[PDB]
Each structure stands twice: as structure tokens, then as C-alpha cells.
Ligand binder design. Structure first.
Ligand SMILES: Nc1ncnc2c1ncn2[C@@H]1O[C@H](COP(=O)(O)OP(=O)(O)O)[C@@H](O)[C@H]1O
Ligand SMILES: CC[C@H](C[S@](=O)(CC[C@H](N)C(=O)O)=NP(=O)(O)O)C(=O)O
Ligand SMILES: [Mg+2]
Ligand SMILES: [Mg+2]
Ligand SMILES: [Mg+2]
Ligand SMILES: [Mg+2]
Length: 507
């Protein structure tokens, strides 16, 4: 079921230096909560400054939903250490609050009055806060409190140069885009390996509640015995409302047209919420997507946007720069929600996705890759589980398939280790591959176990105390203070540069 990648892998070993220079970025989301596990009600910590403009730390959907963002970097350890510094500092400046260690909320009711993210009185600030008011009315606040880790990855220019030789910058920027869509297509096909290894939401609270055979634990949580990531299921951070959009990943102009056409596409269900009600705006528009950001795909095209420019516009201007892997649940066994084993595995898998051939895929061919994903999401650890090629009959045993993939991955790993020196990548392949015959080693089995034997509050507490005792390693306090001061200015500056009133800006 896994494609032959002999030729591309041969090319790679003949061109080892094509992998030197990989760049990475991490986004990690987490809920601020009280020691009793309830949602924190305080505002965005003052030591963090403006969330609107802050470089490293900001807010996602809710004002209590922190997001930590590492600046793009090519050193794994440095990046993860930088991420920990952001945690360390925040944990020493939110009083007695602490972070939620899991993707799923445990003590948040549906309809719970949850403060939207606030971004002050600027037109951009109010626009973002309004986007979120719209999300709340559409999907509900509860779902938008679901937290995840996003893995951001780019291959070096030297990769493309070794593939294509000397060419025009118009041609080369196109090749890059095509390269990344190929990656995306392979990710849709084979990316279910991610939930299977690192999925960490086999359980959920009552609030999230189908004919699925849920069971219970003494702590009051509902779970499926073989599930990996319900965050990715219809019950979690859903994109079902969006499955009719016909967006494809074959070509840059097509991708963008479908995505622009999706912002202009009326939805019947959202009209009913209404755009304006009793003087209070409730959403940006009544369309399937309010803006491009609302595309809840498991991976997406990307280019850092210039000022005022939209995601789609950057893409057309400079082509695809990097890809954003979005399918990672929070790592409950790491105080920073993500670890070096996962980062290293995603390096190997993303590189492999760039190497393997990926036939063009229609909208309905893409919808068909979901069947294996769903299998893994809802019952990935079930003994005997089989997978198929698309919508076809399941025939291939999951362990055999993962092993097949991993023979290729160890080869990529050998190349990466021979550049950086050491054996770290190869060692990660040896650890993870054992998970296929032994699903109890996966994240979803490990945390399911711990939830039955007793969790979210206990881990949060342990992770708070561990973090506060830890000195910063890369940044200093003065760095955090200067960034806070400077973000607060950037916000004031935006608040004073507005010439038109919020109302005219929109239209
Ligand atoms: N060239 C790139 N290659 C790899 N990662 C990148 C690159 N450019 C930016 N990134 C990373 O992408 C992430 C952007 O995060 P963020 O601002 O939260 O965007 P978004 O919300 O759309 O996911 C950063 O963590 C950054 O380090
Ligand atoms: C504001 C809400 C979301 C934001 S989200 O897509 C959320 C990701 C989600 N929590 C997840 O678990 O993957 N994270 P982002 O990558 O935009 O920082 C939106 O833009 O519509
Ligand atoms: Mg983000
Ligand atoms: Mg986010
Ligand atoms: Mg992201
Ligand atoms: Mg093979």
C-alpha cells in the first residue's frame, strides 16, 4: 500500500546535502485553568503584553486559550528549549493558574460563557475578536477550546536546487509550490500514522456528548477502547461543515481559487444566525468560511504574510514557503506539550512525503483518504485492524504497513544523521516502529491507561511546579519585558493609525 520510493531515496543518498538546512516552527495551544481544573477567567496575563502583536506568545480562540509560537529555526534542541522558556516565564506570571495538559477540555460545559480573545480597539483587533464571535456562534465555544500542536516545516533551497539544477526564479518558485502540494497529497494519503503514534485524545467529557460504543471511567470520562485522537473526529475540532468546498491540492492557482471561492460561498445554516442582530455583530459574513484562516484542513499551504496581505495573496506572490502540519494533539507527557521524538519523526515523515510520487487528486479522491484516518482515529489500536487504498476494501494490516513506511524512513534517517552527526534520527525510528506491533506504547494507550488508573489537574499541577523552579536558558526576563513593552506599542500605534471607523473598514 505504501508506494515504491526507491528512485527518490537513491537520489537522496547520492545528494545527502539536499537535506542540510531544514527549518522548523512550533505552535502550541493551552488553556489557562485554576487549580481545581476550571477555566481561568482572568484576562490575558499583563506580563505577556499585547496578544495582537506579540512575536512569541499570543492567544487563539479564547482569551484564556494561550498560544506559544517559536520563531523559525533550524536547531531542534534550541527550538524546544525556546518553547520551554516561553512556558517557564508564563507559569511564573499567571499567579496560581496553570496550563491544561491535554487537547480536550475536561471541565468546560457546552455553552459555557467563555470570553473571546480580546485584541483592543484597533480595526484589526476588533476584526479578529469578531471572527472569534463568529466562530463561537457557528461551531460553539466548547469546540474552539480544543487545543493542539502545529508543526511548521520547510525544506532547504538546496533541496530544490539538487532536484532541478540551474533554472529561472519563476520556474523554481513554481517547482517549490508543486513540491509542497505533492507533500500535502502524500500527507492526506499516509498522515494517519501521526494520530496513531501520537494521538492523545481517546477520551472526552460529557459536554462533547452517536452510535459509537463509548465506555466510562470512574473519573467521569467517556472513552473508546481503541481510539487515538477524538480531537480529529466529528466530535472534536470538526471540519465537516466544510467538506463540501471542493478544495484541492494539485496546483497553486486552483488551490487559491477554491479557497477564495469558499469565502464567497453562501451557507444556509449560517444565514440563520444572522450577520447583525440587535446592534451586535455576530459574524464576519454568512459564508462557509468567514476568512481563509477558517479552513480547518489537517495540513495547509503557507507563506509569511506581508502587512495587510491575506494568506492566499502571499502564496500567489512568492509561492508556497512552508507547510503547517495541524494534526498533532497535545503531548500529555511533556510539560511543553511536544517533545523531541515527535519533532524528529515529523522531519522524517515530511521529507518522505516530498520524495514519494503523488498522483493528482480530485476532491472526491481526497475525501476517500479519510476512511483510513477515521479508522485510526476511532479504532487505530484495535488488534487486527486493516487499512485500504482509498475507498477500497480494507486488506492491508496496519502494522505491516507502518513497518513498510518505516524501512523508508530509516533510510531518510541515515542521511539526516550523517549530516548532523550522531544517531538520533535512527534511534527515533527504532523506538517508534515498535508501536505497530505494540499499540500500548502509543500516546493514546498511555494516557487512556492513566485516566482509568486514577488526571488533567494532577499533570497540570506537576507541570506548573516543575516549570516555576526552572531557570530560563535562552531568553532572559529583560527579553520578555522588552517584547511586552514593544508589542503594547505596536498595538497603540495600530490603534492611532486607523483613519476610518470600524464599520466602514469591513465593507
Ligand atoms: N520558512 C519556514 N519554515 C518552517 N517554519 C516556518 C517558516 N516560516 C515560519 N515558520 C513557522 O510557522 C509558524 C507560524 O505560526 P503562526 O504565526 O501561529 O501561524 P498560524 O497561526 O497560521 O499557524 C512559526 O512557528 C514559524 O516559526
Ligand atoms: C481562531 C481559531 C482558529 C485558530 S487555529 O486554526 C486552531 C487550531 C485548533 N485549536 C487545533 O486544535 O488545531 N490555530 P492557528 O493555526 O490559526 O493559530 C481559527 O483561526 O479559526
Ligand atoms: Mg498559530
Ligand atoms: Mg492556533
Ligand atoms: Mg497553526
Ligand atoms: Mg516499501
Amino acid at each position: 500500500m505504501i508506494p515504491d520510493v526507491s528512485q527518490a531515496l537513491a537520489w537522496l543518498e547520492k545528494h545527502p546535502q539536499a537535506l542540510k538546512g531544514i527549518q522548523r516552527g512550533l505552535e502550541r495551544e493551552t488553556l489557562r485553568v485554576n487549580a481545581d481544573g476550571t477555566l481561568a477567567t482572568t484576562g490575558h496575563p499583563e506580563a505577556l503584553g499585547s496578544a495582537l502583536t506579540h512575536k512569541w506568545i499570543t492567544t487563539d480562540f479564547a482569551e484564556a486559550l494561550l498560544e506559544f509560537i517559536t520563531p523559525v529555526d533550524g536547531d531542534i534542541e534550541h527550538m524546544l528549549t525556546f518553547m520551554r522558556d516561553l512556558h517557564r516565564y508564563t507559569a511564573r506570571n499567571m499567579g496560581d493558574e496553570r496550563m491544561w495538559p491535554l487537547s480536550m477540555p475536561s471541565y468546560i460545559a457546552e455553552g459555557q460563557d467563555i470570553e473571546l480573545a480580546q485584541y483592543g480597539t484597533s480595526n484589526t483587533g476588533r476584526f479578529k475578536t469578531l471572527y472569534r464571535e463568529g466562530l463561537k456562534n457557528r461551531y460553539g465555544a466548547l469546540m474552539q477550546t480544543i487545543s493542539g500542536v502545529h508543526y511548521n516545516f520547510s525544506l532547504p533551497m538546496a533541496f530544490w536546487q539538487a532536484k532541478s539544477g540551474d533554472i529561472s526564479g519563476a520556474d523554481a518558485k513554481e517547482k517549490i509550490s508543486a513540491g509542497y502540494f505533492r507533500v500535502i497529497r502524500n500527507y492526506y494519503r499516509f498522515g494517519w500514522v501521526i494520530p496513531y503514534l501520537f494521538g492523545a485524545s481517546p477520551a472526552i467529557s460529557s459536554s462533547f456528548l452517536t452510535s459509537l460504543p463509548f465506555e466510562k471511567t470512574e473519573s467521569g470520562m467517556y472513552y473508546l477502547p481503541y481510539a487515538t485522537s477524538l480531537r480529529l473526529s466529528d466530535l472534536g475540532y470538526t471540519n465537516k461543515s466544510q467538506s463540501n468546498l471542493g478544495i484541492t491540492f494539485n496546483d497553486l492557482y486552483e488551490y487559491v481559487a477554491g479557497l477564495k471561492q469558499a469565502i464567497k460561498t453562501p451557507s444556509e445554516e449560517y444565514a440563520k444566525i444572522g450577520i447583525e442582530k440587535d446592534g451586535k455583530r455576530l459574524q464576519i459574513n454568512s459564508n462557509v468560511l468567514q476568512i481563509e484562516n477558517e479552513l480547518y484542513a489537517p495540513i495547509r499551504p503557507k507563506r509569511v504574510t506581508r502587512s495587510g496581505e491575506s494568506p492566499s495573496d502571499a502564496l500567489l506572490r512568492g509561492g508556497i514557503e512552508y507547510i503547517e502540519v495541524r494534526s498533532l494533539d497535545i503531548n500529555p507527557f511533556s510539560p511543553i506539550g511536544v517533545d523531541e521524538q515527535q519533532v524528529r519523526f515529523l522531519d522524517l515523515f515530511m521529507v518522505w512525503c516530498a520524495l514519494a510520487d503523488a498522483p493528482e487528486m480530485s476532491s472526491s479522491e481526497l475525501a476517500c483518504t479519510r476512511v483510513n484516518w477515521n479508522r485510526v482515529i476511532l479504532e487505530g489500536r484495535k488488534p487486527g485492524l486493516t487499512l485500504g487504498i482509498g475507498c477500497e476494501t480494507a486488506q492491508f494490516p496496519l502494522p505491516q504497513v507502518g513497518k513498510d513506511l518505516f524501512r523508508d524512513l530509516k533510510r531518510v534517517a541515515q542521511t539526516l544523521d550523517s549530516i548532523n552527526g550522531g544517531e538520533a534520527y535512527q534511534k527515533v525510528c527504532d523506538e517508534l516502529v515498535a508501536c505497530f506491533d505494540n499499540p500500548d506504547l502509543t500516546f493514546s494507550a498511555r494516557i487512556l491507561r492513566s485516566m482509568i488508573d486514577t488526571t488533567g489537574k494532577a499533570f497540570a499541577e506537576a507541570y506548573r511546579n516543575l516549570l516555576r523552579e526552572e531557570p530560563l536558558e535562552i531568553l532572559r526576563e529583560e527579553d520578555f519585558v522588552a517584547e511586552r513593552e514593544a508589542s503594547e506599542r505596536r498595538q497603540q500605534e495600530m490603534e492611532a493609525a486607523d483613519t476610518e471607523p470600524f464599520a466602514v473598514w469591513l465593507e
